[PDB]
Short mmCIF file of C-alpha atoms in Angstrom, two decimals:
data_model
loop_
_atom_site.label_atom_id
_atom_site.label_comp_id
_atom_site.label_asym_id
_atom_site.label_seq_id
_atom_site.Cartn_x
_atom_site.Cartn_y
_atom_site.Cartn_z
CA UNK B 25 -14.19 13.24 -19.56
CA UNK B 26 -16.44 12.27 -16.17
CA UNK B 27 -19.44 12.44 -15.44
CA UNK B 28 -21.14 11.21 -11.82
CA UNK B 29 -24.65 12.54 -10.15
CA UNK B 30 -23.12 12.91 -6.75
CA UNK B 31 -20.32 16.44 -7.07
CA UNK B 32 -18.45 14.62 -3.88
CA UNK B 33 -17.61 11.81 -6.54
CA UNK B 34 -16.96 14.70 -8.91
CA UNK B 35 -14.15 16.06 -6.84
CA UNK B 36 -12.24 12.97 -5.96
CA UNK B 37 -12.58 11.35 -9.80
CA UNK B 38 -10.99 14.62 -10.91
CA UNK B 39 -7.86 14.53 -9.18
CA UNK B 40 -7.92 10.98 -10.04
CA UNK B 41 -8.38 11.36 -14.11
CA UNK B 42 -5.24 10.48 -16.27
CA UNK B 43 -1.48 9.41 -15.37
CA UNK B 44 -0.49 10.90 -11.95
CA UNK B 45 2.91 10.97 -10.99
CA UNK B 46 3.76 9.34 -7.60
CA UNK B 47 6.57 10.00 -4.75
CA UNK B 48 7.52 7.13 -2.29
CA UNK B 49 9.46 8.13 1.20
CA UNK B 50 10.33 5.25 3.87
CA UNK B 51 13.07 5.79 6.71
CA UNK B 52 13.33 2.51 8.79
CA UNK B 53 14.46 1.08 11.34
CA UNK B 54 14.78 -2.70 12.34
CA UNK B 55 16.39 -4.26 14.90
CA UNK B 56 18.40 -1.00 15.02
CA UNK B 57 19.29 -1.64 10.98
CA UNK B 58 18.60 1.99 9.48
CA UNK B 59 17.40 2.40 5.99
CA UNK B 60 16.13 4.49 3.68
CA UNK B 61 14.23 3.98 0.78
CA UNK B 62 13.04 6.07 -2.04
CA UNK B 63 10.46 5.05 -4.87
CA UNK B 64 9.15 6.74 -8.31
CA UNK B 65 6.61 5.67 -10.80
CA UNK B 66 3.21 6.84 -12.19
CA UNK B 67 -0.07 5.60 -11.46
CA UNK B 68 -3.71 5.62 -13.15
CA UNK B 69 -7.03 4.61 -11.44
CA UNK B 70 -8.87 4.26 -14.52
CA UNK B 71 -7.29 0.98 -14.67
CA UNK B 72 -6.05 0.19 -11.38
CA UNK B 73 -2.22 0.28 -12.37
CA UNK B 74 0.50 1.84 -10.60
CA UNK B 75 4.30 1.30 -11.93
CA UNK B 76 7.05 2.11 -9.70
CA UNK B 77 10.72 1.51 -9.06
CA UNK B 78 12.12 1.84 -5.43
CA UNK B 79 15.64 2.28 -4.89
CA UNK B 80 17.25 1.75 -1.06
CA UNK B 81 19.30 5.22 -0.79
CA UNK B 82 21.30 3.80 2.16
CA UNK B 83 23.11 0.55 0.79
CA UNK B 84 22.00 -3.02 0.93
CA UNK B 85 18.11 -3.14 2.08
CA UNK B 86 18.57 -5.10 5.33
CA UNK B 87 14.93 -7.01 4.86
CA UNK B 88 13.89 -8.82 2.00
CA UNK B 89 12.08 -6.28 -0.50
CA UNK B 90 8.61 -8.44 -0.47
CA UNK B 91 7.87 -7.40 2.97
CA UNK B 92 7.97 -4.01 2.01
CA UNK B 93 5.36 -4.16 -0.86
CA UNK B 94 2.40 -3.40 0.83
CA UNK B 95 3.99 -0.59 2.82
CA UNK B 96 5.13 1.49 -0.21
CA UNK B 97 -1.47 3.80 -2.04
CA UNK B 98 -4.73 2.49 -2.70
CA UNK B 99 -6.42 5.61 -3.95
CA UNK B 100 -5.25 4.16 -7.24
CA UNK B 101 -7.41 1.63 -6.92
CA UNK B 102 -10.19 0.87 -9.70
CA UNK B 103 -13.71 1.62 -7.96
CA UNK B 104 -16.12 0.42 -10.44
CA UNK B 105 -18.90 3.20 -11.44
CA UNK B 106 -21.28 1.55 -9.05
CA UNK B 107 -19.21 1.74 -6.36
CA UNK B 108 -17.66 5.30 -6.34
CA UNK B 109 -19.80 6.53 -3.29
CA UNK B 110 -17.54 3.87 -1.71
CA UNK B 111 -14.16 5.03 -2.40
CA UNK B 112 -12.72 6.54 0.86
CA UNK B 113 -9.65 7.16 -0.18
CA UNK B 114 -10.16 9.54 -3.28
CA UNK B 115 -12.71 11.25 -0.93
CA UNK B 116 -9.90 12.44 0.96
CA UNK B 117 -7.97 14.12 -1.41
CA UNK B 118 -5.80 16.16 -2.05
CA UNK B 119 -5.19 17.20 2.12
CA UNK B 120 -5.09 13.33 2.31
CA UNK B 121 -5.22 10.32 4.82
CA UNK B 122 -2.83 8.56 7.27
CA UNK B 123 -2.57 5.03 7.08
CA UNK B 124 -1.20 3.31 9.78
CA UNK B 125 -0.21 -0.61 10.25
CA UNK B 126 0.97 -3.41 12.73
CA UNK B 127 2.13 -6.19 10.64
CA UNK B 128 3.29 -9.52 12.87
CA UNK B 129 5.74 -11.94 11.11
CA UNK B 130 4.37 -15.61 12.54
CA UNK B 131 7.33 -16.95 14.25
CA UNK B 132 9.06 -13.77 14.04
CA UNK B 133 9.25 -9.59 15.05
CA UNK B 134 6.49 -6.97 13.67
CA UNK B 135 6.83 -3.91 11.65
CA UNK B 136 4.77 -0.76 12.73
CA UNK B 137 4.50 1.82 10.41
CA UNK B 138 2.34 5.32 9.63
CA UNK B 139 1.97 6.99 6.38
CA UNK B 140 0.35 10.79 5.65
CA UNK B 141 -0.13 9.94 1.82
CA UNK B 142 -1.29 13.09 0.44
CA UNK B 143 -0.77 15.44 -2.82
CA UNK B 144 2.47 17.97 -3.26
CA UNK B 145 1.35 20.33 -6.33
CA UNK B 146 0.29 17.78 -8.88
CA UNK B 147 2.39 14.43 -7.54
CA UNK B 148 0.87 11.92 -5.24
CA UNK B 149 3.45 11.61 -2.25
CA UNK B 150 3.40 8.66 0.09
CA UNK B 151 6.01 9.20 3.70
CA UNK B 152 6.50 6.49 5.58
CA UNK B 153 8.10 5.90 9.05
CA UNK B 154 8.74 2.11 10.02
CA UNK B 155 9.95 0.54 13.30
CA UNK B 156 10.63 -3.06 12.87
CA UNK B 157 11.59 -5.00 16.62
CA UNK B 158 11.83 -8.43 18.12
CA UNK B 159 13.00 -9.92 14.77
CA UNK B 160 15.78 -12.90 14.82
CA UNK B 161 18.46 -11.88 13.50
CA UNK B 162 18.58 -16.46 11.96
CA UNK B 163 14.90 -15.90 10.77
CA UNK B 164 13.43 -15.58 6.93
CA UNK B 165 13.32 -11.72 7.45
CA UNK B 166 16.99 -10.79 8.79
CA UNK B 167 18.64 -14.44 6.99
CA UNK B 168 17.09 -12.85 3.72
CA UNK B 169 15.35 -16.55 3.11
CA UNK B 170 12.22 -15.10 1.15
CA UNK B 171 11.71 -15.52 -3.01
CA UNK B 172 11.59 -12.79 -4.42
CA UNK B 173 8.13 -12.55 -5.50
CA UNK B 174 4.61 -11.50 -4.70
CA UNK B 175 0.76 -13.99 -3.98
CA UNK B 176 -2.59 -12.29 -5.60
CA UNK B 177 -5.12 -11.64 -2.86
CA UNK B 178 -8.35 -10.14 -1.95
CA UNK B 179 -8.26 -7.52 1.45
CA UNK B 180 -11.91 -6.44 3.12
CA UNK B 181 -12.38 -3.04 3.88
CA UNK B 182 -14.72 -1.94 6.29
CA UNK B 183 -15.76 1.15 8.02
CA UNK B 184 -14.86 2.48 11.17
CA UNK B 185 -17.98 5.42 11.38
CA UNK B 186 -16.15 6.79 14.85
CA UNK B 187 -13.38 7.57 13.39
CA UNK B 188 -14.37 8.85 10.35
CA UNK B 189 -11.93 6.51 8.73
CA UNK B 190 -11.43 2.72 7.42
CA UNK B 191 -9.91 -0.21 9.44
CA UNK B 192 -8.78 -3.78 7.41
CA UNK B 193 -7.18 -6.91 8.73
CA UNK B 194 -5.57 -9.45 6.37
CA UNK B 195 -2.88 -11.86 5.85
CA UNK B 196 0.16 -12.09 3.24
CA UNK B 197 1.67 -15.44 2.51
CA UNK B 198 5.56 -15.11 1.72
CA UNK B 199 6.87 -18.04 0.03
CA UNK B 200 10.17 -19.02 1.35
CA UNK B 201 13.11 -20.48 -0.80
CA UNK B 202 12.51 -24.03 0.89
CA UNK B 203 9.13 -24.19 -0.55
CA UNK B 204 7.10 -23.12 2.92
CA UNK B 205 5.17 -20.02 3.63
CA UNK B 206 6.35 -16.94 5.84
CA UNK B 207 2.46 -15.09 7.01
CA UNK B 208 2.57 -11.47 7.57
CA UNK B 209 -0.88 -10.81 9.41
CA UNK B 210 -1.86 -7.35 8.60
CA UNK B 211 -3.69 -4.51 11.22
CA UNK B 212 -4.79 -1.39 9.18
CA UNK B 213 -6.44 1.97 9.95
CA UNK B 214 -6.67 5.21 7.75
CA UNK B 215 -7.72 8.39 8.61
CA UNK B 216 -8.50 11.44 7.18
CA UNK B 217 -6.06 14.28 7.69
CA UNK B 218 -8.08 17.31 6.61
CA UNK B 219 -11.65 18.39 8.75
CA UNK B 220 -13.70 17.84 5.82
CA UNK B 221 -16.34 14.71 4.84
CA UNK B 222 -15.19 12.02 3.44
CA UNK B 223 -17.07 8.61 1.78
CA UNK B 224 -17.45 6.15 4.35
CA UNK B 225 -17.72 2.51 2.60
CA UNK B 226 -19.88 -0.07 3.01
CA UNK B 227 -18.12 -3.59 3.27
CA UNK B 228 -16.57 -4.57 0.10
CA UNK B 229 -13.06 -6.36 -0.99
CA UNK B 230 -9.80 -4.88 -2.80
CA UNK B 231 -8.71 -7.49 -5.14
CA UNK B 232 -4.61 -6.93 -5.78
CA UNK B 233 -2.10 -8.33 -8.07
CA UNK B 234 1.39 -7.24 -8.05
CA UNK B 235 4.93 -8.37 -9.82
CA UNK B 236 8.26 -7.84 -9.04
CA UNK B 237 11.21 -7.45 -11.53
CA UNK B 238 14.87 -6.03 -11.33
CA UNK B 239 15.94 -3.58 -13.71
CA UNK B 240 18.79 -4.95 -15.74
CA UNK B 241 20.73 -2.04 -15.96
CA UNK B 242 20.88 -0.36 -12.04
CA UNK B 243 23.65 -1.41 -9.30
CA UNK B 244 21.85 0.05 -6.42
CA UNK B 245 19.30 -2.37 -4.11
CA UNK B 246 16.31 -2.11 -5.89
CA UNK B 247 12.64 -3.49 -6.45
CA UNK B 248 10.24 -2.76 -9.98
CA UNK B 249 6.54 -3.38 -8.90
CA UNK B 250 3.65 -3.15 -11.18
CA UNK B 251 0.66 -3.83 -8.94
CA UNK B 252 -3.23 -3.83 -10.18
CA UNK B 253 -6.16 -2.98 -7.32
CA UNK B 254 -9.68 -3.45 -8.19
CA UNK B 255 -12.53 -2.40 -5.66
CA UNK B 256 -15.42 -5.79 -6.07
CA UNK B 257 -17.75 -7.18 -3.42
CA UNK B 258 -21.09 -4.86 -4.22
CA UNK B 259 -23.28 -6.14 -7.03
CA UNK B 260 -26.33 -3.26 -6.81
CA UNK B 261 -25.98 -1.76 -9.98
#
């Protein structure tokens, strides 16, 4: 069923064993353009899979859908069994984490955004607030000039021991519909929300796929995502 040496693994695997059903809350905010946007789906760690459909509640999303992605939960992630001492974000469960971003369009305005992804009952909930400013109103991310579709990467995770939490910088490439490349240059930091220890990692890599689709048969704005994260980067073992 599971079965680790260290009971601080124990705990977090647990939660973290089978199909867990998953909750997605965004209000936002850019350039004075408020939205809403409300996601369901399922996710399970053993493989690194999460499935979920968002749905804008408040009309027509006023940003392109792909620069939302990595804003709407990497406790789903796959740790392999060698790494599970490593996997800060399961440690934290179920009183949970904040995660909190600056992400700077090149060329264009920034989204900030905090998250308090924790567990309701038996259903992983992620709430998000996001304030997006200084964006041109003729640029890729207002004009609605990004494909719509998503560029595997790998994102490094490191420690921050003073904190008792994780910082990661990274960058997105967005292809735009001309055939050039929007970046997105990613600030992270995650916290724990309850008093309790958590795993602090050494450095290691997330390695994350993720595809977008439209479901055929719903009239509201919408995105499908199926996104894979595997923890890598730590051979011992």
């Amino acid at each position: 069923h599971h079965h680790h040496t260290d009971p601080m693994v124990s705990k977090g695997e647990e939660l973290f064993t089978g199909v867990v059903p998953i909750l997605v809350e965004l209000d936002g905010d850019v350039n004075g353009h408020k939205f809403s946007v409300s996601g369901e789906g399922e996710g399970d760690a053993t493989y690194g899979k999460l499935t979920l459909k968002f749905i804008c509640t408040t009309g027509k999303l006023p940003v392109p859908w792909p620069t939302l992605v990595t804003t709407l939960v990497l406790c789903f992630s796959r740790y392999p069994d060698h790494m599970k001492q490593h996997d800060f974000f399961k440690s934290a469960m179920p009183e949970g984490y904040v995660q909190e971003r600056t992400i700077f369009f090149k060329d264009d305005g920034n989204y900030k955004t905090r998250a308090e992804v924790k567990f309701e009952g038996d259903t992983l909930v992620n709430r998000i607030e996001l304030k997006g400013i200084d964006f041109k109103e003729d640029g890729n991310i207002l004009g609605h000039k990004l494909e719509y579709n998503y560029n595997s990467h790998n994102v490094y995770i490191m420690a921050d021991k003073q904190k008792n939490g994780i910082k990661s910088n990274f960058k997105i490439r967005h292809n735009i519909e001309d055939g050039s490349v929007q970046l997105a240059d990613h600030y992270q930091q995650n916290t724990p929300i309850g008093d309790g220890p958590v795993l602090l990692p050494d450095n290691h890599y997330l390695s994350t796929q993720s595809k977008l689709s439209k479901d055929p048969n719903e009239k509201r704005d919408h995105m499908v995502l199926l996104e894979f994260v595997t923890a890598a980067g730590i051979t011992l073992g």
